Amino acid sequence: WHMPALVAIFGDDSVLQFGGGTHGHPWGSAAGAAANRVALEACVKARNAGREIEKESRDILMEAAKHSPELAIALETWKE
Amino acid sequence: TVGDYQTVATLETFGFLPPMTQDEIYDQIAYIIAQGWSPLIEHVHPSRSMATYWSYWKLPFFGEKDLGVIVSELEACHRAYPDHHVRLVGYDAYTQSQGACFVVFEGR
Amino acid sequence: TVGDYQTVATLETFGFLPPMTQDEIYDQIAYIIAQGWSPLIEHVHPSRSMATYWSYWKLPFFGEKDLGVIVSELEACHRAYPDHHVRLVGYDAYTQSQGACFVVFEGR
Amino acid sequence: TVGDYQTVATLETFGFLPPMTQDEIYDQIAYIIAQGWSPLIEHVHPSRSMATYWSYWKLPFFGEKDLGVIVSELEACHRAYPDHHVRLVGYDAYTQSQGACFVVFEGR
Amino acid sequence: TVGDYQTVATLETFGFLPPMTQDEIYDQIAYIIAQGWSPLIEHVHPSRSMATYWSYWKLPFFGEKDLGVIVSELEACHRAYPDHHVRLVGYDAYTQSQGACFVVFEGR
Numbered sequence: 238w239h240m241p242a243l244v245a246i247f248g249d250d251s252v253l254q255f256g257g258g259t260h261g262h263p264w265g266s267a268a269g270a271a272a273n274r275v276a277l278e279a280c281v282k283a284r285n286a287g288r289e290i291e292k293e294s295r296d297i298l299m300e301a302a303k304h305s306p307e308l309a310i311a312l313e314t315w316k317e
Numbered sequence: 318t319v320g321d322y323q324t325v326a327t328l329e330t331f332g333f334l335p336p337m338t339q340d341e342i343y344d345q346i347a348y349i350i351a352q353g354w355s356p357l358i359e360h361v362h363p364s365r366s367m368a369t370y371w372s373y374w375k376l377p378f379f380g381e382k383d384l385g386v387i388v389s390e391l392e393a394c395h396r397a398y399p400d401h402h403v404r405l406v407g408y409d410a411y412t413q414s415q416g417a418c419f420v421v422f423e424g425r
Numbered sequence: 426t427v428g429d430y431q432t433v434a435t436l437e438t439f440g441f442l443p444p445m446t447q448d449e450i451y452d453q454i455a456y457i458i459a460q461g462w463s464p465l466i467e468h469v470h471p472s473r474s475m476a477t478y479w480s481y482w483k484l485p486f487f488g489e490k491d492l493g494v495i496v497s498e499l500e501a502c503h504r505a506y507p508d509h510h511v512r513l514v515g516y517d518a519y520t521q522s523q524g525a526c527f528v529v530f531e532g533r
Numbered sequence: 534t535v536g537d538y539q540t541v542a543t544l545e546t547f548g549f550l551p552p553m554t555q556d557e558i559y560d561q562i563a564y565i566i567a568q569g570w571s572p573l574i575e576h577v578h579p580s581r582s583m584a585t586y587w588s589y590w591k592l593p594f595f596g597e598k599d600l601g602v603i604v605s606e607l608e609a610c611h612r613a614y615p616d617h618h619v620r621l622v623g624y625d626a627y628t629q630s631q632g633a634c635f636v637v638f639e640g641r
Numbered sequence: 642t643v644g645d646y647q648t649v650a651t652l653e654t655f656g657f658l659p660p661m662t663q664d665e666i667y668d669q670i671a672y673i674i675a676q677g678w679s680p681l682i683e684h685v686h687p688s689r690s691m692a693t694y695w696s697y698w699k700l701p702f703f704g705e706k707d708l709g710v711i712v713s714e715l716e717a718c719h720r721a722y723p724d725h726h727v728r729l730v731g732y733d734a735y736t737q738s739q740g741a742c743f744v745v746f747e748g749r
Contacts, residue, residue, distance in 0.1 A: 263320075264320035264322065264483075265320075265322070265481065265483065265484055267322045267324075267481075268320055268322045271322055271333070274333050275333045275334070278330065278331055278333055278334055279334065281330075281331075282331060282334065282341075285344070285345055285348045285349075285417070286341070286344045286345075286348070287344065287348065301334065304334070304335050305333070306319070306320065307320065307322065310320070318505050320483075321482065321483060321505070374537065375536055375537055393534065397534055397537070426717070426721055427699075428699050428700075429697075429698055429699050429721075590645060591644055591645050609642075613642055613645065
């Protein structure tokens, strides 16, 4: 859920490194990466579309889990 | 098979999300024009998708200040090369970098 | 014809014996549970049998004390990938080695 | 579609030019003979077009001042190998170089 | 056509000539035995014909003075391997080399 907070202020020339964010996914470590990669690109695509990522976090992040079941549970574990 | 994730191929960016509709490209082109970059279109065959340099179509639209003509160009390359990827790229003249790089048509 | 031995392909171990029967698998899994190791199942296409790392399914059964689930869970990965090898692996946490590594299904 | 210049395969020279006419070959052979060079006929399987050595046919025409045999012998190599590039090569004995190396037949 | 020599594939020895008649192989075996060498038979598939070591059939014939068995054992090898080469080799023990190495059957 912190992706809109680490993209709106870190720009695009930044690297996001997780300690337990990837490995702490119930569906293994492979699904953990798909949970952040989908969440990251949704925030960017919302910023290019002129939306406010830091303000519309819930609606930007939730509409990507519909086409991505991994995020559909990643949003539930790290609620909210 | 839930939850069993399989290794899947995306090109570089915006591939994990569903294919872009016609309206999303409108806003992306509006943004890339508003940033002052120069839109540019490339295409290659999916077999050589890992190549460093793609093929131009045709030249970068230097000094282009309207999105109403770009939407026509992207279709011509696709109908000329129906089995090739179509990349929409933006060129930054000052920093010599790319502001946005995402495949628009995945290649039939 | 005798005597002309023809070289044949074996995976790592137990390839020279006939295909494992159900009761043999039961005894092997019971032993692997009794030794305290962690059962683990992998699967790859037969062409990629030389790959260093196989595909997990789904997570290592850390300290499972029931042998009736893995035998049913080994068939699940088999139906999910009926054109793949099905290997059984035992994970030891303290010595960080594998005391049992044998393929179960040859791949239909 | 213009302007879209697509990369195309040309061998060494005159490949950008549509195929040479019969009367043109007469003039090229006359020029080669007038320079004192030695005509020579080579042919290679088109997939092996990248080899630095082709196959002779048959031996170099050393000291030949008649152009009525080269065209008939050039075509004989074509009947013998109808799926081969046909090359006409001129040897310069004094400089140990080649003053004219052009493909006459594209290869059926 | 003459004279335009074409490159042809030969295994190592006696392949430039027509394949040996059963009378010629009889004399070759007689010579090999009379020199005191050890006949031995090999076989591989023609695709891997350039391999360093072939496959034995069945074992070396240490000091065999009966030449009626080799002629029937190669036919057994040929029938068992209808699409494999059949090599007959004469093993010399004192010099640790091979006194003769010539392919007998070319493989159907």
